[PDB]
Point group: none
Chain length 79, copies 2
């Protein structure tokens, strides 16, 4: 089994979208997703504030991020 | 004209994976992707060290990231 936690902040559309994207996968694993907010726990603002939202798997920051290749292509075809 | 840089650290599989994922896009644009390593440059570590890999387009921090659902599913479901 694994634990999964998302670290979010207030007024964070990216936080809400990432949560909605991962919920089916976490639920398929039989896991309860936990959520902590850097605007409530300053210890977390200090540790993670520069890169929220963060996903923790087994209480370790988990690298499950990819570049949007269409947004990257769009930037490169602009003058 | 454009530049693309990836900012990396040593022994980071996520840096290698992202570099491979973006390489065809940078090369479709006739651009040569460059690479700088925070473990070889202390200023660069101060700025980016805790959130590599970072992508710079025209020297600005590219913000359009998405969750890799299949990578998370792989880690949790197998």
């Amino acid at each position: 089994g694994h634990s999964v936690e998302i670290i979010v902040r207030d007024n964070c559309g990216s936080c809400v979208r990432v949560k909605a994207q991962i919920l089916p996968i976490v639920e398929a694993a039989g896991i309860k997703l936990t959520e902590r907010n850097v605007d409530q726990d300053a210890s977390l603002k200090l540790e993670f504030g520069d890169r929220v939202p963060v996903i923790l798997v087994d209480d370790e920051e988990f690298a499950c991020w990819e570049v949007d290749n269409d947004e990257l292509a769009n930037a490169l075809l602009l003058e």
